[PDB]
C-alpha cells in the first residue's frame, strides 16, 4: 500500500539536460525538406515556408537505438492546419509529399500521431489508423495543447505521449531493433515547431 515510480517517472524527475545536450538532439538542418529551415536565432525551432500543396518533414539529429528518451514538442494550435503529425521515423522515411497529407505514417518508415484527428498512422497505404488516446469514443476529439511530451522506449520498443501531465498510453509497439529519429510533418505556412530534448535513461 504505497507509491512506486515507473522508469518514465524517474526520467521526468531528473533535471533536464543543458542547452548543449538539447542542441545535440535538436532538428537536423541537413536532414529536412527543402521547404523548411532551422532558425539560426533559435536552433530548437524549425520554420516552414508557405508552399502551396506541399507536406514537409524534418528529422532530429539523433536516431535512437536503445534507452528511454523524452522530448517536448511545442506547436501553437493556430499553426497546425489540416495535417499536423508528430512521431518517429527511420532514416529512410520520405520528408516531403505533394498535397496535404499524413506524411509521417503514410509508409513503412514512419509512425505518427495526427494531432487534429487524434489518430495514429503507420504504413497507412496498407494498415488502418487507430484512435489515440484509445479511451476516446469514435467521434470524440480533444485539442492537443501547444506543448506535450514524446516518450520513445527503444528497450520496450514503444512510443507514448504525455499530455497535460497525463500519460496517454502506448501509441506504437514493435519498435525494438530499429534506429528511430524524432520527426514531424507539417502543411501550415510559417508554422514553427520546437523540439526540446528533456532526458534519456541508459
Amino acid at each position: 500500500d504505497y507509491c512506486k515510480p515507473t522508469r518514465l517517472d524517474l526520467l521526468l524527475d531528473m533535471p533536464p539536460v543543458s542547452y548543449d545536450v538539447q542542441l545535440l538532439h535538436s532538428w537536423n538542418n541537413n536532414d529536412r525538406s527543402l521547404n523548411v529551415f532551422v532558425k539560426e536565432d533559435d536552433k530548437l525551432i524549425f520554420h516552414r515556408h508557405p508552399v502551396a500543396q506541399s507536406t514537409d518533414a524534418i528529422r532530429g539529429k539523433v536516431g535512437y537505438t536503445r534507452g528511454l528518451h523524452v522530448w517536448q514538442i511545442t506547436w501553437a494550435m493556430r499553426q497546425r492546419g489540416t495535417h499536423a503529425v508528430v512521431g518517429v521515423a527511420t532514416a529512410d522515411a520520405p520528408l516531403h509529399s505533394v498535397g496535404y497529407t499524413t506524411l509521417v505514417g503514410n509508409n513503412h518508415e514512419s509512425w505518427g500521431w495526427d494531432l487534429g484527428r487524434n489518430r495514429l498512422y503507420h504504413d497507412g497505404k496498407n494498415q488502418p489508423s487507430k484512435t489515440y488516446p484509445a479511451f476516446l469514443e469514435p467521434d470524440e476529439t480533444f485539442i492537443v495543447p501547444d506543448s506535450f511530451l514524446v516518450a520513445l522506449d527503444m528497450d520496450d520498443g514503444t512510443l507514448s505521449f504525455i499530455v497535460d501531465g497525463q500519460y496517454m498510453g502506448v501509441a506504437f509497439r514493435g519498435l525494438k531493433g530499429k534506429k528511430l529519429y524524432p520527426v514531424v510533418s507539417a502543411v501550415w505556412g510559417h508554422c514553427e515547431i520546437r523540439m526540446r530534448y528533456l532526458n534519456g535513461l541508459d
Partner: peptide, 8 residues
Amino acid sequence: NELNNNLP
C-alpha cells in the same frame, strides 16, 4: 486566405 496559409 489559402487553406493552410500558403502562397498560391
